[PDB]
Amino acid sequence: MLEVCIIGFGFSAIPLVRELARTQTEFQIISAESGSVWDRLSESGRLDFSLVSSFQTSFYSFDLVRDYEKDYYPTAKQFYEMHERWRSVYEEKIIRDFVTKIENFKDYSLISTRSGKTYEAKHVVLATGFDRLMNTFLSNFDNHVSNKTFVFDTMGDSANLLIAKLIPNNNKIILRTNGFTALDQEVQVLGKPFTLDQLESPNFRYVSSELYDRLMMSPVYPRTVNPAVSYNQFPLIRRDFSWVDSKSSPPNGLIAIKYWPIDQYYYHFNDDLENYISKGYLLNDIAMWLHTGKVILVPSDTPINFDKKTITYAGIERSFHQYVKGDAEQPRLPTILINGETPFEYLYRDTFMGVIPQRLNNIYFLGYTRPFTGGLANITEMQSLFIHKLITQPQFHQKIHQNLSKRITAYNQHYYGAAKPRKHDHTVPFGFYTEDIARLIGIHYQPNECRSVRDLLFYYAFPNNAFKYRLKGEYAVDGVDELIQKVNDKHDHYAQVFVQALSIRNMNSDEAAEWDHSARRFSFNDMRHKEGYRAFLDTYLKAYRQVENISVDDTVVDEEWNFMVKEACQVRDKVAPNIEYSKDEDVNKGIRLILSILDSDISSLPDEAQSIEFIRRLLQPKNYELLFIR
Ligand SMILES: Cc1cc2nc3c(=O)[nH]c(=O)nc-3n(C[C@H](O)[C@H](O)[C@H](O)COP(=O)(O)OP(=O)(O)OC[C@H]3O[C@@H](n4cnc5c(N)ncnc54)[C@H](O)[C@@H]3O)c2cc1C
Numbered sequence: 159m160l161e162v163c164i165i166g167f168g169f170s171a172i173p174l175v176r177e178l179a180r181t182q183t184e185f186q187i188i189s190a191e192s193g194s195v196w197d198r199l200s201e202s203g204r205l206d207f208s209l210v211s212s213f214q215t216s217f218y219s220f221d222l223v224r225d226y227e228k229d230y231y232p233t234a235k236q237f238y239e240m241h242e243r244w245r246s247v248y249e250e251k252i253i254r255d256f257v258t259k260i261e262n263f264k265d266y267s268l269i270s271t272r273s274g275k276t277y278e279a280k281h282v283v284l285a286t287g288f289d290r291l292m293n294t295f296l297s298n299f300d301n302h303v304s305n306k307t308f309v310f311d312t313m314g315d316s317a318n319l320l321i322a323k324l325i326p327n328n329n330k331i332i333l334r335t336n337g338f339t340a341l342d343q344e345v346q347v348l349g350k351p352f353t354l355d356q357l358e359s360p361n362f363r364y365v366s367s368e369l370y371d372r373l374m375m376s377p378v379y380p381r382t383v384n385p386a387v388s389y390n391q392f393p394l395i396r397r398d399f400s401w402v403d404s405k406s407s408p409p410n411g412l413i414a415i416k417y418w419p420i421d422q423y424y425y426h427f428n429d430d431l432e433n434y435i436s437k438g439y440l441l442n443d444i445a446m447w448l449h450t451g452k453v454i455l456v457p458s459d460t461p462i463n464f465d466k467k468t469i470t471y472a473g474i475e476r477s478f479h480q481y482v483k484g485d486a487e488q489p490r491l492p493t494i495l496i497n498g499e500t501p502f503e504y505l506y507r508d509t510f511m512g513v514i515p516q517r518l519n520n521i522y523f524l525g526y527t528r529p530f531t532g533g534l535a536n537i538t539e540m541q542s543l544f545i546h547k548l549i550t551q552p553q554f555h556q557k558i559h560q561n562l563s564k565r566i567t568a569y570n571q572h573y574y575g576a577a578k579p580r581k582h583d584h585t586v587p588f589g590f591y592t593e594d595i596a597r598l599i600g601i602h603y604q605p606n607e608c609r610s611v612r613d614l615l616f617y618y619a620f621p622n623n624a625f626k627y628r629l630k631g632e633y634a635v636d637g638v639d640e641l642i643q644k645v646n647d648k649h650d651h652y653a654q655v656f657v658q659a660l661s662i663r664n665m666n667s668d669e670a671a672e673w674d675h676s677a678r679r680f681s682f683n684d685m686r687h688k689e690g691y692r693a694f695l696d697t698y699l700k701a702y703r704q705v706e707n708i709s710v711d712d713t714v715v716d717e718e719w720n721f722m723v724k725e726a727c728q729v730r731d732k733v734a735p736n737i738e739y740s741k742d743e744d745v746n747k748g749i750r751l752i753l754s755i756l757d758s759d760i761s762s763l764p765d766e767a768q769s770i771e772f773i774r775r776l777l778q779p780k781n782y783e784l785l786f787i788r
């Protein structure tokens with residue numbers, strides 16, 4: 159009898175397959191001849207974009223320990239090429255077939271395929287990915303279309319990439335939506351670029367949820383009246399967050415689009431523009447789009463007639479080429495029959511950690527948890543270790559399964575509270591989720607075991623990437639020690655984010671919100687760093703056009719657009735003139751102090767002032783309890 163059957167092989171299954179091979183656990187892989195989105199993109203020649211996520215968080219530890227030399231954003235092509243190298247390694251283990259049904263019994267499953275071949279497996283892993291409605295617009299939709307109006311109903315990473323490809327052909331973009339959360343994928347810290355995922359210091363939640371909340375949420379919730387922030391210049395981008403019923407911030411179920419702010423795009427690519435664009439580094443600055451009016455927001459309830467293909471805003475009945483419904487995404491599960499008979503119904507909240515479903519035996523879900531920021535690799539790598547330990551160690555299987563029902567209840571209380579199930583429940587802050595899996599497995603770190611200030615930085619400030627937990631113990635990866643030193647050496651041991659937490663320990667929500675926005679350039683949606691980039695933007699559009707052999711005339715005028723843009727940008731034409739310290743000042747001093755006491759013993763530190771008292775209490779954080787683990 160087959161010990162393990164993995165269904166679907168793309169990206170998510172790689173780490174688990176690796177661990178099963180290591181313990182010589184008997185496994186077979188079944189995966190469709192047709193492959194995935196990435197093969198459609200490959201063969202239609204549309205691997206012509208880059209990831210929104212850092213190398214550090216998008217490629218697995220066993221690759222990073224060989225190939226990390228610096229932070230960069232991988233291209234679509236580099237991501238697919240990495241899928242194809244790992245497929246080649248394991249191709250002998252893969253049956254090319256399509257699973258149509260799983261019949262789940264007490265300690266085994268009967269798997270049906272389209273060939274009609276049947277397989278019996280004690281443990282079954284689904285790593286089948288998602289059906290995504292937007293994939294067609296990326297796969298197929300045309301790059302010649304020009305000067306048309308498009309209406310999007312929702313704003314996600316796919317819509318934002320499509321908008322990036324549309325804008326250089328003078329296509330006009332209308333977002334009719336109930337707000338969206340966008341974040342600069344990169345932040346300049348004392349002149350050095352940090353991806354946003356490197357600045358979240360998530361283990362500060364254990365100190366207090368209130369402190370973690372005021373440190374993180376001012377770019378998301380409208381807490382500052384600083385007139386430089388997009389959610390003040392363009393109030394329509396604001397969301398209804400009344401659904402949120404949890405002390406854990408940022409909450410599970412929050413989604414953001416991550417985008418290149420034009421200032422950082424310039425710093426990276428100005429020097430060799432066309433060649434960078436040709437590689438898939440595309441400018442997707444939604445905030446620069448709202449600034450220059452190439453995108454406009456209109457109310458959620460703005461009247462639209464699909465019969466005549468017109469939207470009614472600014473007293474103008476406006477004609478559009480295409481309405482884009484908006485990315486719904488569904489896990490590609492085959493029919494699963496409970497005890498051979500009753501169809502299983504998938505709901506994220508009814509699985510433990512997005513992996514273990516109820517009323518099924520020895521069936522695990524790999525790849526159906528989405529990270530709030532950073533790449534999927536961090537999530538799937540930790541899920542792979544969790545599944546590996548559940549499949550190979552019966553004691554661990556029993557320990558998790560015995561009280562599965564109450565772990566799930568305790569998880570849902572902590573992270574969702576009394577909120578109704580939502581379609582984005584599957585979205586988790588990466589640094590909570592990786593840490594949660596690490597504590598479940600026992601490869602986590604103990605704050606009490608920190609000895610030096612250096613150790614405290616590693617524990618609190620070093621990002622909770624999967625490879626953080628493969629330094630030592632049960633799932634150690636060779637070379638992770640040198641990886642961490644490289645990453646620490648390049649990011650000043652994450653002293654800046656440690657200092658951020660220190661700066662707001664004694665503030666309230668509102669004070670923290672003002673402080674986070676006092677910078678010359680604050681991290682997210684800073685509308686002061688747009689105007690001075692218009693010259694660069696034309697160099698960009700021209701370079702893009704040259705790359706894609708496009709002709710277009712920038713003298714054509716859509717006076718109806720102008721009335722709608724000016725109607726749209728009314729609040730901005732009021733607020734932006736009100737524009738015009740602390741964060742820049744506090745960071746620069748804090749970092750000097752911290753770097754000075756790096757190798758100082760914590761326990762020994764004497765009685766600036768209560769910042770030492772605070773640093774000492776980090777050995778004994780008061781909000782460490784996670785009842786889905788304990
Ligand atoms: C446009 C786009 C951009 C993305 N950008 C990023 C990014 O910047 N950073 C990031 O970290 N992530 C990103 N992702 C998300 C993620 O990294 C990819 O979706 C990834 O391909 C998911 O890998 P997977 O193994 O879960 O699924 P897939 O890659 O889809 O692989 C699943 C495989 O299972 C097969 N299969 C499905 N059902 C069956 C069945 N019943 N029987 C047999 N075989 C089956 C499929 O044919 C496929 O070959 C992006 C996704 C998309 C679509």
Ligand SMILES: N[C@@H](Cc1c[nH]c2ccc(Br)cc12)C(=O)O
Nearest residue numbers: 354357358373374378408674681
């Ligand atoms: N005070 C932090 C906020 C931050 C940093 N990184 C983040 C990522 C997601 C979200 Br929501 C917030 C952040 C910063 O500005 O560096």
